Amino acid sequence: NNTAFAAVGANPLEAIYQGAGAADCEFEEISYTVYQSYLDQLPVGQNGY
Amino acid sequence: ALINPQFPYAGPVPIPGPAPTETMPLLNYRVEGRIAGIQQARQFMPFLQGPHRAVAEQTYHAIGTGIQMGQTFNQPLINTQEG
């Protein structure tokens, strides 16, 4: 709530929303899902991969 | 190149040039690099090395069994022609 909402006249650099209603804005929730991208199988021979 | 007399092309860029900097130096890089994480001997795949059948042949097992049994009816006797 501290970084996401900027009051009128405040620096909006790190904020998501700015406006006269900022002081009363609140996140209800945040969710994240991390997906990892990689290469599998890799063929192995007499020197390793 | 064309040179034209009497307006000749200066015979050089001369000594009035403005040396702008001494920043000419590339500092050699000195470094030690180590990529040493424990390696485990195995990887999992869905399938590696298989040469899957596109069609199989028809395949079978075999059996026989029984005995030699029979009910018979014969042709009647006939007059012999010749001989």
CB atoms within 10 A of CB A7: 14
Count CB pairs under 8 A between chains A and B. Answer: 9
* Among A20, A19, A15, A17, CA closest to A3: A15
* Among A34, A20, A11, CA closest to A3: A11
> Are A23 and A15 within 8 A, CB to CB?
no
Single-letter residue type at A34 = V
> Are A4 and A15 within 8 A, CB to CB?
yes
CB atoms within 10 A of CB B36: 5
Q: Write down the residue that tokens 């092309």 correspond to.
A: B9
Q: How was this structure determined?
A: X-ray
Residue of B nearest to A42 (CA): B43
Residue of B nearest to A43 (CA): B43
